């Protein structure tokens, strides 16, 4: 139920001069170099260094998904919650992680994989039924812009509503079903093309936008008819990058907007320390991202925060932001519940069901007590237990007296010694 | 050159700001007709912040008065200072909302908001640099809190960075005037923290209990209490208007008092409030100025400061006084009262001195105080909306105007939230 | 420009709108012959070029006498001599004569009128329908303008000040079927309706203005005092100016609870006038008096829900806020759990007139308490008793069924006002 | 709504009834309500091939499915 933060270090192919270091895979140091001419022998800072659940210098897109959102994406189809979201630099890889360039597209990214192993296990559990919804909404400038469907760009009806039964979700957030991978790529390809992108000295192509692409899983057993359904969740979100604003400049919806990216950021990392500290309320209406994420984060959800860093010789006062961020994230630890449908008819039909069979159990034990019950009955009739062994592929009842006919004949003695 | 275009809402609203402008006006030496006479060069040194030059010597106000019933404007324009407002800046709607937010904000105000942001728009534009808006009006109220809100929200989306300023009555804790202001408070309250930047809490009932036990006065009507609201007003930007010798702005004001943008609902006061009786008994000291400031019963709120903590408090001193004074007055009086104040701010006093004070008065101070004792207003209106609520009284006005019934707990569920917000800042601890 | 459409129908209706419009003409000062010698008139009269001011009010009645008393007193040429409308044949108590035969032409004309009156209105705050629920003209022919005014102007604020038969006191024998019906019709159409008892006017009148023999002239009177303090924010400027649309928004809490006990006060004549301060405490007091109420329902029985106070003249905010203050905390007076509120209260500026000939004094302060309280359910309980005590057998049935109705009608309205009086008992118990 | 309330005041009059009934039974196995811990199910599948059993009265669903269907058929 921990937070495993984990860090991911963009590849600089003009391999600039690295100062990170990882000795063991679990603790990152950075070396700032001591101005020689500030005040010589009189500075005193130049070494820091961070513990993190796991970095990787330099992976394939693969070997990234399988060690970061494997487990996640797992205990959502076991039920629990899953989030996973994206902070860095800008231009740090901070979308390249989350669905981004990858390698030829041919399932690459994180969602794009997360999505293919989504639907993998759909098919691979073929005993239980599952119902998966996507959703897509970007925040731009405190305001929600729902991409999927049709894109209004009002922001209109779209608001925050707090825990129904204990999640946080969208009011008028279009929640498109998916049965087959390739509608849910068209989903998300959608998204992409429609969320706001803007030229940067950074990044030539700067998500100006924390865009936030929720799976919800809605469950039901192999014998299904409204038993343990629904409630589960999983939010892939990528954050915007957290700019200087020493380059930028231009007011020209390259800083109005990173202003706004910057309030987003800070309040998101206001609210991480308000729940390391473990006050009462840490509050998580001071904007829309918290708002967004506020089962996440805590609440019943397994959070795994990725921290997209570049190490260049001038980007170190960013990466060690963002490390610090990261640190600070993961004295984190939220709650795994279970949580399934509240339905109505679910309900009355589940425990209609306990009634009847209750009432059944009852008449028969009744019934055996008043009348008679004879045990130790058919000793000699091994063909019960063949025909037993043989429905055993099909659905049916056996003896309830002498030990429920010894276990079932001891389970049919083992399934035939597990079919030989 | 900073200007602050001001748009009264409501009858309420409407009577505040008519009060506020003749105030203005009086202070500025400008007469009913807008020819200036009051023979100082400070007075026409900064009249841009809040009027414009018409063709001869005139100075209109930048104000615009809404309303959904043309009987408050009627008032206001047979009023004293009726004849300054723009002819033009006068929108009204035909019927008026029968004290229903939901017919002020969806049914009603929709079609009069396009009126009043087309004559914002053009008041706005005109201004060379534009401090921002201020707003006043009467939470409770269903023309007055439904368009203040509906126009804030507007006014918000247009100009997110230009300062938004509110005076807002809310409805009185003992006494209450309407059925719904539970409601309207409620419904109100969650646009308000959305989008105001800067909120001032008003109650009928404290400016009730300010004039009979400081002013002693026998007969105080509405009049009177628009009138110290008005004075209120006015100290708050005449930094912005005569020269100081710490001058402060209301942006200024803004990032000096609210810690965290949620908890932007202020307290404010003014002083000097003396009795006619006691006027020549009373000495005009700074020390005396700032005793009578952190007084609970000068609050213009119903809260108590005593019950809560100070989050932050600023005070605009007006005159010729040492900076010194100010200064180690307020340093005296958080170290005495250090348990109302909160911990883990080192200081929570924003001091400003402005060189000019309001006529007739040689000193005066207003004070614009944070405090977590706004608690209580707002779990007092909650107990009586979810009182309400419960059974649904009233509910099929609200409902019938094409407001869902969840807007009703959403609203519930923020002001809840703010509360606790309030709470968890009071009983925070340093460390 | 705030205009409101007075309909009075009945005996009752017309003799209550003389006194209003003889109220309306000293307010304004508008001499009986149509003109007087700003724009306060316009919510009760329409200004002519030629300067004669003509009242916007129609005076609908199946009997002739009542309206011709009009036309030839001094009150000829003020009125509009077509809005004067008269029948042929009287409804004679008989809700199903002037619901389903007489009532039709008649409410045909009426709705051409009333139409015409509104073409003639800038804005159009509502109706104040004024009837006596207890009589056929009153009852059906008034029931059946309501229904067409609901179906076709619709959203209009119509206030029906609905004169309901006294508890034992009555002047009909038939008056309680009638009173069923028209209440059953009524209870979906108007939105704010006013029950008035002629037995607790008459006990108003022998206590406070020791008018040992009272008549319809001073009942009327009184119920045109009511209803001018009612209106005075539509046509003089105050502090707290209240609305005919504020009253159901800040007095109706459900759709199908909107009936009202009113109060007015002071009621006193001129000997015993300028012999007590008559504060603002002490006139609320008076008001919230169970024996100043102008409906024979004690509200010590029941809940206030509601409290909608209008006071007219000197008073000042701070002296009605001390007012409500101590009604309050007053342990007699107990509200509902759900509405700590439960106070509308507005101020104008403008005394009540005195009507020359009449009892009521000079005073400088008057208030109207309009109060929806759960404490109402008691008349209907009594007329529900009245009702099936002579319905069980089917007393006088045949009359009314001789003008087009059913038992299956009895029936529905009884069953009605049952749910009327569970829906009272509802609203009271937690 | 009604319906819902009334069937699970049923149902708890049902599982009182077996209460008192296993009261002078010989003893009070656990009420069958449900399985929170479904790694018992895969506990007992797993010692399917070993020597173990566990059903009451319920027979806990059959065996849950007779270990579903011996993990089906030892995944084929
Ligand atoms: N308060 C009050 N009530 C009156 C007055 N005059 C008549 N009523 C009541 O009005 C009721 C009957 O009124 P109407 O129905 O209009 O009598 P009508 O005009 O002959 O018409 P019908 O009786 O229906 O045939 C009686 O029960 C009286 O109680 C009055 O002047 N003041
Ligand atoms: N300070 C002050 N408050 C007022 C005045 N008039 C009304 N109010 C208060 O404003 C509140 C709401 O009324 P309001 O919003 O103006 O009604 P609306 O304009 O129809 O929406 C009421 O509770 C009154 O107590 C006034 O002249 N001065
Ligand atoms: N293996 C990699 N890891 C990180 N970044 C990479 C990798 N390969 C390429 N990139 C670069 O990362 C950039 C994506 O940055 P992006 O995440 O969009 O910035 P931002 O964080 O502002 O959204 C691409 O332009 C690409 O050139």
Same mark, same amino acid.
């Given at each position: 139920?921990?937070?495993?933060?984990?860090?991911?270090?963009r590849?600089?192919?003009?391999?600039?001069?690295?100062?990170?270091?990882?000795?063991?895979?679990?603790?990152?140091?950075?070396?700032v170099?001591?101005?020689?001419?500030?005040?010589?022998?009189?500075?005193?800072?130049?070494?820091?260094?961070?513990?993190?659940?796991?970095?990787?210098?330099?992976?394939?897109?693969?070997?990234?998904?399988?060690?970061?959102?494997?487990?996640?994406?797992?205990?959502?189809?076991?039920?629990?919650?899953?989030?996973?979201?994206?902070?860095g630099?800008?231009?740090?890889?901070?979308?390249?992680?989350?669905s981004?360039?990858?390698?030829?597209?041919?399932?690459?990214?994180?969602?794009?994989?997360?999505?293919?192993?989504?639907?993998?296990?759909?098919?691979?559990?073929?005993?239980?039924?599952?119902?998966?919804?996507?959703?897509?909404?970007?925040?731009?400038?405190?305001?929600?812009?729902?991409?999927?469907?049709?894109?209004?760009?009002?922001?209109?009806?779209?608001?925050?509503?707090?825990?129904?039964?204990?999640?946080?979700?969208?009011?008028?957030?279009?929640?498109?079903?998916?049965?087959?991978?390739?509608?849910?790529?068209?989903?998300?390809f959608?998204?992409?093309?429609?969320?706001?992108?803007?030229?940067?000295?950074?990044?030539?192509?700067?998500?100006?936008s924390?865009?936030?692409?929720?799976?919800?899983?809605?469950?039901?057993?192999?014998?299904?008819?409204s038993?343990?359904?629904?409630?589960?969740?999983?939010?892939?979100?990528?954050?915007?990058?957290?700019?200087?604003?020493?380059?930028?400049?231009?007011?020209?919806?390259?800083?109005?907007?990173?202003?706004?990216?910057?309030?987003?950021?800070?309040?998101?990392?206001?609210?991480?320390?308000?729940?390391?500290?473990?006050?009462?309320?840490?509050?998580?209406?001071?904007?829309?991202?918290?708002?967004?994420?506020?089962?996440?984060?805590?609440?019943?959800?397994?959070?795994?925060?990725?921290?997209?860093?570049?190490?260049?010789?001038?980007?170190?006062?960013?990466?060690?932001?963002?490390?610090?961020?990261?640190?600070?994230?993961?004295?984190?630890?939220?709650?795994?519940?279970?949580?399934?449908?509240?339905?109505?008819?679910?309900?009355?039909?589940?425990?209609?069901?306990?009634?009847?069979?209750?009432?059944?159990?009852?008449?028969?034990?009744?019934?055996?007590?008043?009348?008679?019950?004879?045990?130790?009955?058919?000793?000699?009739?091994?063909?019960l237990?063949?025909?037993?062994?043989?429905?055993?592929?099909?659905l049916?009842?056996?003896?309830?007296?002498?030990?429920?006919?010894?276990?079932?004949?001891?389970?049919?003695?083992?399934?035939?010694?597990?079919?030989? | 050159?900073?200007?602050?275009?001001?748009?009264?809402?409501?009858?309420?609203?409407?009577?505040?700001?008519?009060?506020?402008?003749?105030?203005? /006006?009086?202070?500025?030496?400008?007469?009913?007709?807008?020819?200036?006479?009051?023979?100082?060069?400070?007075?026409?040194?900064?009249?841009?912040?809040?009027?414009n030059?018409?063709?001869?010597?005139?100075?209109?106000?930048?104000?615009?008065?809404?309303?959904?019933?043309?009987?408050?404007?009627?008032?206001?324009?047979?009023?004293?200072?009726?004849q300054?407002?723009?002819?033009?800046?006068?929108?009204?709607?035909?019927?008026?909302?029968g004290?229903?937010?939901?017919?002020?904000?969806?049914?009603?105000?929709?079609?009069?908001?396009?009126?009043?942001?087309?004559?914002?728009?053009?008041?706005?534009?005109?201004?060379?640099?534009?401090?921002?808006?201020?707003?006043?009006?009467?939470?409770?109220?269903?023309?007055?809190?439904?368009?203040?809100?509906?126009?804030?929200?507007?006014?918000?989306?247009?100009?997110?960075?230009?300062?938004?300023?509110?005076?807002?009555?809310?409805?009185?804790?003992?006494?209450?005037?309407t059925?719904?202001?539970?409601?309207?408070?409620?419904?109100?309250?969650?646009?308000?923290?959305?989008?105001?930047?800067?909120?001032?809490?008003?109650?009928?009932?404290?400016?009730?209990?300010?004039?009979?036990?400081?002013?002693?006065?026998?007969?105080?009507?509405?009049?009177?209490?628009?009138?110290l609201?008005?004075?209120?007003?006015?100290?708050?930007?005449?930094?912005?208007?005569?020269?100081?010798?710490?001058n402060?702005?209301?942006?200024?004001?803004?990032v000096?008092?609210?810690?965290?943008?949620?908890?932007?609902?202020?307290?404010?006061g003014?002083?000097?409030?003396? /009795?006619?009786?006691?006027?020549?008994?009373?000495?005009?000291?700074?020390?005396?100025?700032?005793?009578?400031?952190?007084?609970?019963?000068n609050?213009?709120?119903?809260?108590?400061?005593?019950?809560?903590?100070?989050?932050?408090?600023?005070?605009?001193?007006?005159?010729?006084?040492?900076?010194?004074?100010?200064?180690?007055?307020?340093?005296?009086?958080q170290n005495?009262?250090?348990?109302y104040?909160?911990?883990?701010?080192?200081?929570?006093?924003?001091?400003?001195?402005?060189?000019?004070?309001?006529?007739?008065?040689?000193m005066?101070?207003?004070?614009?105080?944070?405090?977590?004792?706004?608690?209580?207003?707002?779990?007092?209106?909650?107990?009586?909306?979810?009182?309400?609520?419960?059974?649904?009284?009233?509910?099929?006005?609200?409902?019938?105007?094409?407001?869902?019934?969840?807007?009703?707990?959403?609203?519930?569920?923020?002001?809840?939230?703010?509360?606790?917000?309030?709470?968890?800042?009071?009983?925070?601890?340093?460390? | 420009?705030?205009?409101?459409?007075?309909?009075?129908?009945?005996?009752?209706?017309?003799?209550?709108?003389?006194?209003?419009?003889?109220?309306?003409?000293?307010?304004?000062?508008?001499?009986?012959?149509?003109?007087?010698?700003?724009?306060?008139?316009?919510?009760?009269?329409?200004?002519?070029?030629?300067?004669?001011?003509?009242?916007?009010?129609?005076?609908?009645?199946?009997?002739?006498?009542?309206?011709?008393?009009?036309?030839?007193?001094?009150?000829?040429?003020?009125?509009?001599?077509?809005?004067?409308?008269?029948?042929?044949?009287?409804?004679?108590?008989?809700?199903?004569?002037?619901?389903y035969?007489?009532?039709?032409?008649?409410?045909?004309?009426?709705?051409?009128?009333?139409?015409?009156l509104?073409?003639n209105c800038?804005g159009?705050?509502?109706?104040?329908?004024?009837?006596?629920?207890?009589?056929?003209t009153?009852?059906?022919?008034?029931?059946?303008?309501?229904?067409?005014?609901?179906?076709?102007?619709?959203?209009?604020?119509?206030?029906?000040?609905?004169?309901?038969?006294?508890?034992?006191?009555?002047?009909?024998?038939?008056?309680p079927?009638?009173?069923?019906?028209?209440?059953?019709?009524?209870?979906?159409?108007?939105?704010?309706?006013?029950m008035?008892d002629?037995?607790?006017?008459?006990?108003?009148?022998?206590?406070?203005?020791?008018?040992?023999?009272?008549?319809?002239?001073?009942?009327?009177?009184?119920?045109?005092?009511?209803?001018?303090?009612?209106?005075?924010?539509?046509?003089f400027?105050?502090?707290?100016?209240?609305?005919? =649309?504020?009253?159901?928004?800040?007095?109706?809490?459900?759709?199908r609870?909107?009936?009202?006990?009113?109060?007015?006060?002071?009621?006193?004549s001129?000997?015993?006038?300028?012999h007590?301060?008559?504060?603002?405490?002490?006139?609320?007091?008076?008001?919230?008096?169970?024996?100043?109420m102008?409906?024979?329902?004690?509200p010590?029985?029941?809940?206030?829900?509601?409290?909608?106070?209008?006071?007219?003249?000197?008073?000042?905010?701070?002296?009605?806020?001390?007012?409500?203050?101590?009604?309050?905390?007053?342990?007699?007076?107990?509200?509902?759990?759900?509405?700590? =509120?439960?106070?509308?209260?507005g101020?104008?500026?403008?005394?009540?007139?005195?009507?020359?000939?009449?009892?009521?004094?000079?005073?400088?302060?008057?208030?109207?308490?309009?109060?929806?309280?759960?404490?109402?359910?008691?008349?209907?309980?009594?007329?529900?008793?009245?009702?099936?005590?002579?319905?069980?057998?089917?007393?006088?049935?045949?009359?009314?069924?001789?003008?087009?109705?059913?038992?299956?009608?009895?029936?529905?309205?009884?069953?009605?006002?049952?749910?009327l009086?569970?829906?009272?008992?509802?609203?009271?118990?937690?």
């Amino acid at each position: 139920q921990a937070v495993k933060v984990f860090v991911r270090t963009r590849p600089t192919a003009t391999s600039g001069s690295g100062l990170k270091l990882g000795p063991d895979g679990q603790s990152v140091s950075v070396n700032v170099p001591k101005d020689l001419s500030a005040g010589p022998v009189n500075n005193q800072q130049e070494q820091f260094s961070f513990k993190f659940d796991g970095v990787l210098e330099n992976v394939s897109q693969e070997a990234a998904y399988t060690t970061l959102a494997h487990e996640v994406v797992d205990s959502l189809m076991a039920g629990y919650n899953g989030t996973i979201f994206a902070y860095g630099q800008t231009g740090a890889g901070k979308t390249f992680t989350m669905s981004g360039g990858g390698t030829a597209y041919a399932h690459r990214g994180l969602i794009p994989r997360a999505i293919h192993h989504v639907f993998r296990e759909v098919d691979m559990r073929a005993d239980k039924m599952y119902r998966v919804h996507v959703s897509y909404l970007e925040i731009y400038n405190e305001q929600l812009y729902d991409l999927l469907g049709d894109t209004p760009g009002t922001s209109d009806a779209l608001a925050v509503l707090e825990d129904s039964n204990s999640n946080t979700y969208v009011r008028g957030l279009t929640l498109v079903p998916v049965r087959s991978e390739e509608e849910a790529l068209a989903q998300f390809f959608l998204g992409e093309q429609g969320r706001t992108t803007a030229g940067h000295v950074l990044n030539a192509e700067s998500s100006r936008s924390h865009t936030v692409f929720t799976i919800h899983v809605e469950m039901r057993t192999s014998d299904a008819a409204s038993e343990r359904a629904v409630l589960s969740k999983l939010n892939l979100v990528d954050l915007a990058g957290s700019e200087r604003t020493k380059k930028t400049g231009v007011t020209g919806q390259t800083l109005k907007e990173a202003q706004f990216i910057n309030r987003s950021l800070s309040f998101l990392e206001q609210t991480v320390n308000a729940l390391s500290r473990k006050d009462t309320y840490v509050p998580f209406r001071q904007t829309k991202l918290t708002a967004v994420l506020r089962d996440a984060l805590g609440g019943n959800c397994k959070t795994v925060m990725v921290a997209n860093i570049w190490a260049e010789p001038s980007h170190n006062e960013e990466t060690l932001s963002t490390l610090r961020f990261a640190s600070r994230v993961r004295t984190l630890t939220t709650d795994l519940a279970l949580n399934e449908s509240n339905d109505p008819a679910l309900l009355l039909r589940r425990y209609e069901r306990q009634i009847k069979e209750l009432k059944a159990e009852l008449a028969m034990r009744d019934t055996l007590s008043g009348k008679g019950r004879v045990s130790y009955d058919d000793l000699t009739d091994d063909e019960l237990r063949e025909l037993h062994a043989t429905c055993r592929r099909f659905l049916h009842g056996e003896a309830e007296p002498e030990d429920l006919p010894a276990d079932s004949m001891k389970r049919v003695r083992e399934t035939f010694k597990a079919l030989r | 050159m900073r200007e602050i275009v001001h748009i009264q809402g409501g009858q309420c609203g409407n009577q505040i700001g008519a009060k506020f402008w003749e105030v203005v /006006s009086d202070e500025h030496g400008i007469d009913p007709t807008g020819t200036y006479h009051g023979d100082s060069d400070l007075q026409l040194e900064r009249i841009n912040v809040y009027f414009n030059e018409a063709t001869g010597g005139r100075y209109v106000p930048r104000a615009i008065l809404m309303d959904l019933e043309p009987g408050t404007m009627d008032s206001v324009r047979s009023g004293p200072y009726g004849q300054i407002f723009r002819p033009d800046n006068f929108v009204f709607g035909q019927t008026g909302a029968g004290n229903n937010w939901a017919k002020g904000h969806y049914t009603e105000g929709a079609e009069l908001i396009d009126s009043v942001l087309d004559v914002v728009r053009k008041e706005a534009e005109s201004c060379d640099c534009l401090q921002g808006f201020q707003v006043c009006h009467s939470l409770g109220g269903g023309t007055g809190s439904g368009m203040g809100t509906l126009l804030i929200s507007k006014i918000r989306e247009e100009y997110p960075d230009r300062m938004m300023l509110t005076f807002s009555v809310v409805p009185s804790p003992k006494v209450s005037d309407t059925v719904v202001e539970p409601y309207n408070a409620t419904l109100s309250v969650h646009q308000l923290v959305e989008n105001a930047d800067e909120c001032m809490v008003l109650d009928n009932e404290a400016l009730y209990d300010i004039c009979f036990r400081t002013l002693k006065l026998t007969t105080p009507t509405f009049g009177d209490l628009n009138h110290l609201i008005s004075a209120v007003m006015s100290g708050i930007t005449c930094c912005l208007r005569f020269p100081g010798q710490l001058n402060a702005d209301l942006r200024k004001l803004a990032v000096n008092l609210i810690p965290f943008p949620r908890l932007h609902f202020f307290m404010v006061g003014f002083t000097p409030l003396t /009795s006619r009786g006691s006027q020549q008994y009373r000495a005009l000291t700074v020390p005396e100025l700032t005793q009578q400031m952190w007084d609970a019963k000068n609050m213009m709120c119903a809260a108590d400061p005593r019950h809560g903590r100070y989050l932050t408090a600023s005070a605009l001193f007006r005159g010729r006084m040492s900076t010194k004074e100010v200064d180690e007055q307020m340093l005296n009086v958080q170290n005495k009262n250090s348990s109302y104040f909160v911990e883990w701010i080192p200081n929570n006093v924003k001091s400003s001195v402005c060189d000019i004070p309001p006529k007739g008065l040689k000193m005066s101070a207003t004070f614009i105080g944070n405090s977590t004792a706004i608690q209580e207003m707002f779990k007092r209106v909650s107990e009586q909306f979810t009182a309400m609520f419960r059974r649904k009284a009233f509910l099929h006005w609200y409902t019938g105007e094409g407001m869902d019934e969840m807007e009703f707990t959403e609203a519930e569920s923020n002001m809840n939230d703010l509360v606790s917000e309030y709470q968890q800042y009071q009983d925070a601890s340093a460390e | 420009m705030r205009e409101v459409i007075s309909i009075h129908i009945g005996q009752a209706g017309i003799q209550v709108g003389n006194a209003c419009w003889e109220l309306y003409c000293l307010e304004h000062g508008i001499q009986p012959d149509g003109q007087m010698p700003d724009d306060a008139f316009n919510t009760f009269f329409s200004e002519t070029g030629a300067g004669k001011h003509v009242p916007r009010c129609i005076f609908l009645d199946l009997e002739p006498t009542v309206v011709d008393e009009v036309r030839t007193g001094t009150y000829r040429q003020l009125f509009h001599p077509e809005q004067l409308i008269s029948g042929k044949e009287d409804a004679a108590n008989n809700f199903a004569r002037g619901h389903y035969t007489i009532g039709k032409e008649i409410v045909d004309l009426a709705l051409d009128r009333i139409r015409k009156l509104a073409d003639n209105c800038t804005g159009l705050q509502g109706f104040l329908v004024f009837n006596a629920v207890g009589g056929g003209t009153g009852s059906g022919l008034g029931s059946l303008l309501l229904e067409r005014l609901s179906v076709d102007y619709g959203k209009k604020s119509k206030l029906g000040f609905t004169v309901y038969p006294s508890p034992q006191v009555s002047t009909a024998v038939v008056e309680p079927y009638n009173s069923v019906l028209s209440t059953h019709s009524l209870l979906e159409h108007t939105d704010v309706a006013v029950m008035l008892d002629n037995e607790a006017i008459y006990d108003i009148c022998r206590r406070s203005l020791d008018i040992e023999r009272p008549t319809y002239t001073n009942l009327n009177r009184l119920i045109a005092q009511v209803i001018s303090s009612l209106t005075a924010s539509l046509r003089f400027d105050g502090a707290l100016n209240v609305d005919i =649309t504020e009253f159901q928004t800040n007095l109706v809490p459900y759709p199908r609870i909107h009936f009202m006990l009113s109060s007015y006060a002071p009621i006193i004549s001129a000997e015993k006038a300028y012999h007590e301060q008559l504060s603002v405490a002490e006139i609320t007091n008076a008001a919230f008096e169970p024996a100043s109420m102008m409906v024979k329902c004690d509200p010590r029985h029941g809940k206030y829900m509601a409290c909608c106070l209008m006071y007219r003249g000197d008073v000042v905010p701070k002296d009605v806020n001390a007012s409500v203050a101590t009604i309050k905390t007053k342990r007699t007076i107990q509200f509902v759990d759900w509405c700590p =509120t439960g106070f509308k209260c507005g101020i104008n500026y403008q005394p009540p007139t005195v009507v020359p000939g009449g009892d009521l004094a000079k005073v400088q302060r008057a208030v109207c308490m309009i109060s929806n309280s759960t404490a109402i359910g008691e008349i209907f309980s009594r007329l529900d008793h009245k009702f099936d005590l002579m319905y069980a057998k089917r007393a006088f049935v045949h009359w009314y069924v001789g003008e087009g109705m059913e038992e299956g009608e009895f029936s529905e309205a009884r069953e009605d006002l049952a749910a009327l009086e569970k829906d009272f008992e509802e609203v009271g118990a937690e």
